[PDB]
Amino acid sequence: MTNEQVIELVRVLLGGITTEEISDQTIIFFWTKWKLTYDLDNRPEKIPAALYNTVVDCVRWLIVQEVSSGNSSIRERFEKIGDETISVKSWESWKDFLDWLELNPDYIDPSLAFNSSLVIIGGVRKDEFFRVKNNPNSYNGFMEQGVYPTPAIPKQSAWP
Amino acid sequence: MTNEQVIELVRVLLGGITTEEISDQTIIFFWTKWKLTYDLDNRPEKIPAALYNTVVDCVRWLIVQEVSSGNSSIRERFEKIGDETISVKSWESWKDFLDWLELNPDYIDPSLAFNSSLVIIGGVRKDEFFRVKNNPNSYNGFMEQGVYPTPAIPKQSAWP
Amino acid sequence: AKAHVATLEGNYSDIVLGRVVAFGDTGWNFKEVDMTFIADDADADSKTTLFAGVLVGEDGTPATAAAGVFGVLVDRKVLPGVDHYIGVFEPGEKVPMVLAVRGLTLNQLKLKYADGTAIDAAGIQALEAQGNQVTDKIVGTQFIGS
Amino acid sequence: AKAHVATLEGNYSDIVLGRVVAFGDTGWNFKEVDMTFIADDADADSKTTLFAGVLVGEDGTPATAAAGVFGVLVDRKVLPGVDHYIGVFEPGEKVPMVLAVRGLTLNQLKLKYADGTAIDAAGIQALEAQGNQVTDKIVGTQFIGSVL
Amino acid sequence: PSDTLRDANQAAQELYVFFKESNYLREAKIESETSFLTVNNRPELVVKSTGKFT
Amino acid sequence: TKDMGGVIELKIPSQILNKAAMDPSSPEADMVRGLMSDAANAHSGEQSFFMLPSDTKDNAPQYSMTLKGIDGMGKQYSTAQLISDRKKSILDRLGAGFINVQTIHTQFVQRVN
Residue B37: C-alpha distances to residues A111, B9, B34, B53, D122 (Å): 9, 21, 5, 12, 65
Q: Any contact of F with C, at least 3 CB pairs below 8 A? A: yes
B89 touching A (Cβ < 8 Å): no
Count of residues making up chain F = 113
Amino acid of residue D60: G
CB E15 within 8 A of CB E32: yes
- The SS3 assignment for B92 reads helix
A147 touching F (Cβ < 8 Å): no
**Residues 6 or more apart in contact with residue F42 via CB below 8 angstroms:** A121, A124, F8, F48
Closest CB to B78: pick one of A14, A87, A92.
A87
Give Cα B132 to chain centroid, integer Å: 29
Q: Can you give the three-state secondary structure of E31-54, one letter per residue?
A: EEECCCCCCCCCCCCCCCCCCCCC
Q: How many CB contacts within 8 angstroms connect chain B with chain F?
A: 46
Q: To the nearest whole angstrom, how far is the Cα of A116 from the nearest Cα of chain F? A: 6
Amino acid of residue D73: L
| Number of CB atoms found within 10 A of residue D77's CB | 20
- Phi first, then psi: give them for residue E39, nearest 5 degrees: -125, 135
- Phi first, then psi: give them for residue F26, nearest 5 degrees: -115, 155
Resolution in angstroms for this experimental structure?
12.7
CA angle, residues A110, A112, A115, in degrees to nearest 5: 100
B95 touching C (Cβ < 8 Å): no
Q: How far apart are CA C31 and CA E11, in angstroms?
A: 28
Side-by-side strand order, sheet with D30-36: D30-36, D94-100, D71-73, D55-56
Q: How far apart are CA C71 and CA C57, in angstroms?
A: 7
Look at residues F38, F35, F33, F37 and name the one whose alpha carbon lies nearest to residue F48: F38
**Residues 6 or more apart in contact with residue A59 via CB below 8 angstroms:** A14, A94, A97, A98, A101
B144 touching A (Cβ < 8 Å): no
Q: Any contact of D with B, at least 3 CB pairs below 8 A? A: no
Q: To the nearest whole angstrom, how far is the Cα of C61 from the nearest Cα of chain B? A: 25
DSSP-H helix ranges across C58-97: none
How was this one solved?
cryo-EM
Q: How far apart are CA D51 and CA D31, in angstroms?
A: 17
Q: Which helix (H) or strand (E) holds C103?
A: none
CB B53 within 8 A of CB B114: no
CB D100 within 8 A of CB D71: yes
**Radius of gyration from C-alpha coordinates of chain F:** 28
- Phi first, then psi: give them for residue A117, nearest 5 degrees: -130, 50
- The SS3 assignment for C105 reads strand
CA angle, residues D66, D67, D72, in degrees to nearest 5: 60
Q: How far apart are CA A96 and CA A16, in angstroms?
A: 19
For residue C146, list chain A residues with Cβ-Cβ distance below 8 A.
119
Torsion angle of the four alpha carbons A126, A129, A135, A139, in this order, in degrees rounded to the nearest 10: -160
Specify whether the backbone of C132 is left (phi greater than 0), alpha (psi in -120 to 50) or beta: beta
Count of residues making up chain D = 148
**Radius of gyration from C-alpha coordinates of chain B:** 27
What letter would DSSP give residue B19?
T
Look at residues B34, B44, B37 and name the one whose alpha carbon lies nearest to residue B10: B34
CB contact under 8 A, A93 and B26: no
CB contact under 8 A, A127 and C146: no
Q: Which residues pair with D57 in a beta bridge?
A: none
Q: How far apart are CA F112 and CA A160, in angstroms?
A: 73
Q: How far apart are CA D63 and CA D112, in angstroms?
A: 9
Amino acid of residue D31: K
| Number of CB atoms found within 10 A of residue C123's CB | 23
Residue-wise DSSP of chain D? -----------SGGGEEEEPPPSS-TTTTEEEEEEE-S-TTS-TT------TTBEE-TTSSBP-SGGG--EEE--GGGSTT----SS-S-TT-EEEEEEE-SSEEEEGGG-B-TTSPBP-HHHHHHHHTTS-EEE----------S--
Residue C19: C-alpha distances to residues A125, B127, C53, D120 (Å): 33, 20, 16, 74
Q: How far apart are CA A137 and CA C115, in angstroms?
A: 43
Q: How far apart are CA C68 and CA D44, in angstroms?
A: 42
For residue C10, list chain F residues with Cβ-Cβ distance below 8 A.
none
Closest CB to F42: pick one of A116, A124, A132.
A124
Torsion angle of the four alpha carbons C27, C28, C29, C35, in this order, in degrees rounded to the nearest 10: 60
Q: How far apart are CA F37 and CA B135, in angstroms?
A: 9
CB contact under 8 A, C143 and F40: yes
CB contact under 8 A, A110 and B82: no
Go through chain A and list every residue after which a break occurs, taking a C to next N gap over 2.5 angstroms, comma-separated. Answer: 89
Q: How many CB contacts within 8 angstroms connect chain B with chain C?
A: 49
Q: How far apart are CA D132 and CA D103, in angstroms?
A: 5
Closest CB to B115: pick one of F18, F23, F43.
F18
CB C35 within 8 A of CB C60: yes
CB F43 within 8 A of CB A121: no
What is the number of H-type helices and E-type strands within chain F? 4, 2
Q: Which helix (H) or strand (E) holds C31?
A: strand C30-36
Residue-wise DSSP of A11-62? HHHTTS--TTTS-HHHHHHHHHHHHHHHTTTT-GGGHHHHHHHHHHHHHHHH
Cα maximum dimension of chain C:
57
Q: Find residues 59-98 of chain C whose CB sits inside 8 Å of chain F.
A: none
Closest CB to B127: pick one of C11, C138, C145.
C138
Strand bridging mode D133-135 / D104-107? parallel
Give the helix, strand, coil percentages of chain C, each rounded to 5.
10, 25, 65
- CA closest to C76 among chain E residues: E3
CB A108 within 8 A of CB B60: no
- Phi first, then psi: give them for residue C27, nearest 5 degrees: -100, 10
Give Cα A91 to chain centroid, integer Å: 20
- CA closest to F16 among chain C residues: C146
Cα maximum dimension of chain E:
68
CB B55 within 8 A of CB B8: no
For residue C10, list chain B residues with Cβ-Cβ distance below 8 A.
134, 136
CB A54 within 8 A of CB A10: yes
Q: How far apart are CA B138 and CA F41, in angstroms?
A: 7
CB B80 within 8 A of CB A85: yes
Q: To the nearest whole angstrom, how far is the Cα of C145 from the nearest Cα of chain E? A: 34
The number of C-alpha atoms within 13 Å of B2 and in the hemisphere containing its C-beta is 3
Residue C39: C-alpha distances to residues C48, C50, C53, C117 (Å): 6, 10, 18, 20
Residue-wise DSSP of B107-148? GT-GGG--S------TTS-HHHHHHHHT-TTB--GGG---SS
Residue A59: C-alpha distances to residues A24, A54, A102 (Å): 14, 9, 11
- Phi first, then psi: give them for residue C99, nearest 5 degrees: -120, 145
Residue A103: C-alpha distances to residues A98, A107, A115, A133, B60 (Å): 9, 10, 10, 36, 13
Look at residues B134, C7, A125 and name the one whose alpha carbon lies nearest to residue F38: A125
Q: How far apart are CA A125 and CA A102, in angstroms?
A: 31
Q: How far apart are CA D81 and CA D12, in angstroms?
A: 10
Residue B46: C-alpha distances to residues B38, B41, B144 (Å): 7, 10, 45
Q: Can you give the three-state secondary structure of B43-76, one letter per residue?
A: CHHHHHHHHHHHHHHHHHHHHHHHCCCCCCCCCC
Go through chain B and list every residue after which a break occurs, taking a C to next N gap over 2.5 angstroms, comma-separated. Answer: 89
Q: How far apart are CA D92 and CA D78, in angstroms?
A: 17
What is the distance between the terminal CA atoms of chain E, rounded to a whole angstrom? 51
CB C60 within 8 A of CB C69: no
Amino acid of residue B129: F
- Phi first, then psi: give them for residue F75, nearest 5 degrees: -70, 155
- The SS3 assignment for C112 reads strand
**Residues 6 or more apart in contact with residue B69 via CB below 8 angstroms:** none
Residue E48: C-alpha distances to residues D144, D147, E40, E41, E51 (Å): 21, 21, 15, 17, 10
The number of C-alpha atoms within 13 Å of D79 and in the hemisphere containing its C-beta is 12
